[PDB]
């Protein structure tokens, strides 16, 4: 008769449109709560440093748990231990970069590699513009550039990661599923640093660029990005 | 049908309205405004009645045929682009025409026409430059203006008026419009001293004269 078939398929199309609209309201209010959480995270450290200073004492802040690691030296002539740790840190090409959470195994892996990388503690703006500008996803071991929220939600929905700013929240506030979210991210392919490098072959302490510059990596992501 | 309003969001920057979705719910007042729920002609022929089919089938089919393009969005045709001047060009500005056969000549600018082009006369008594169109990009705009706001440019001259037809002979209404706008511009620029000699003279570069160093 088809007077029933067309109204049933219209009800199904309207139902999935309403489902998609409720998902977009979910993503909106989640991004709002994340903004509030980042306000509170930023003001909490300032408020506690102030109360320690007016009590006279000091306040050693939370030792940072998230690094961004960039491979600065090329393929040629690398010791094999350093080779294996670099290819577990997923820094294969030169001027790649991955997020890495910090603990005792990871810091020592990083200082085996230390002449070959520049790694630091990224800001929220650095995590933002790395996910938005160079952030692609390892979907079905293909490098699909993250253009919708469905590319992130179909792979990371079971970790309650359903949009890109939720992925950003996971990476910055290193959560339970940091391994899964970071391993979803393909290794970032940054350009050569605009303005240049002071010296590739020496540590940041020694007037160079290798090693652990701590939050001066947020000077350098901005010009490699 | 009702009479249409205009956009209740004032445009803050491009793409962002100044009022959020709940404020615009309130201002539109949707809270009290809710709702619920060819091809044949038959002609007489002297016979019977003949059902003529308009939109007939085609007579011919080419042996190989191209497919349809993909649909993209922002690629408007030229006649509905947005039109810009520079900041240095206001009506009354003297301009230095740089590309035509009227190159180097100083010229009073009149108005911004509908297809982006400028309207132009450095008056024909002075430097033999008629009511002409000129392209904005191809023109140096000096900082020398006249108090032109009290003139009446004719409304019947646009791009369809200056666009070429196909020996070129000057028509009569060209002379009439030329005279009717020059009689309003030329006494307004004889009021500024030494300006008519400026508009008769031509711009040129001599030795030791560099356009980046020189202010105009």
């Amino acid at each position: 008769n088809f007077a029933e078939l067309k109204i049933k398929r219209l009800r199904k199309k309207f139902a999935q449109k309403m489902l998609r609209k409720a998902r977009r309201k979910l993503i909106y209010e989640k991004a709002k709560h994340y903004h509030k959480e980042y306000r509170q995270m930023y003001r909490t450290e300032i408020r506690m440093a102030r109360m320690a200073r007016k009590a006279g004492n000091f306040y050693v802040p939370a030792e940072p748990k998230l690094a961004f690691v960039i491979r600065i030296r090329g393929i040629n002539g690398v010791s094999p231990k350093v080779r294996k740790v670099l290819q577990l840190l997923r820094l294969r090409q030169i001027f790649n970069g991955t997020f890495v959470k910090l603990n005792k195994a990871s810091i020592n892996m990083l200082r085996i590699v230390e002449p070959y990388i520049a790694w630091g503690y990224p800001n929220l703006k650095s995590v933002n513009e790395l996910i938005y500008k160079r952030g692609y996803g390892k979907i079905n071991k293909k490098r699909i550039a993250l253009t919708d929220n469905t590319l992130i939600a179909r792979s990371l929905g079971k970790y309650n990661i359903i949009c890109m700013e939720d992925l950003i929240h996971e990476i910055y506030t290193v959560g339970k599923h940091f391994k899964e979210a970071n391993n979803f991210l393909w290794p970032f392919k940054l350009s050569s640093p605009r303005g240049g490098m002071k010296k590739k072959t020496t540590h940041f302490v020694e007037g160079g660029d290798a090693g652990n510059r701590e939050d001066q990596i947020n000077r350098l992501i901005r010009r490699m990005n | 049908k009702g009479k249409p309003h205009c956009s209740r969001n004032p445009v803050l920057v491009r793409g962002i309205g100044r009022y959020s979705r709940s404020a615009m719910y309130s201002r539109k007042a949707l809270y009290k405004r809710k709702y619920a729920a060819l091809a044949t002609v038959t002609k007489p022929v002297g016979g019977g009645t003949r059902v003529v089919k308009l939109r007939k089938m085609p007579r011919y089919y080419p042996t190989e045929d191209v497919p349809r393009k993909l649909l993209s969005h922002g690629k408007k045709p030229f006649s509905q682009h947005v039109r810009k001047l520079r900041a240095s060009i206001t009506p009354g500005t003297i301009l230095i025409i740089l590309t035509g056969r009227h190159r180097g000549k100083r010229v009073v600018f009149l108005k911004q026409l509908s297809s982006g082009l400028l309207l132009v006369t450095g008056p024909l008594s002075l430097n033999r430059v008629p009511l002409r169109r000129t392209h904005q990009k191809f023109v140096i705009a000096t900082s020398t203006k006249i108090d032109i706001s009290g003139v009446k440019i004719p409304k019947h001259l646009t791009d369809a008026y200056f666009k070429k037809k196909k020996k070129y002979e000057i028509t009569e209404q060209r002379k009439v419009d030329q005279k009717a706008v020059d009689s309003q511009i030329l006494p307004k620029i004889k009021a500024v001293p030494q300006l008519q000699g400026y508009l008769r003279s031509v711009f040129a570069l001599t030795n030791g004269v560099y356009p980046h160093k020189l202010v105009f």
Binding site: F14, A15, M18, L19, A22, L26 | Y35, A36
Partner: peptide
Amino acid sequence: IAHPKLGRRARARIARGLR
């Protein structure tokens, strides 16, 4: 509300209330 099976009656109730 926004996940499909358990929020089905909820999204239906919102869709009815939009009239």
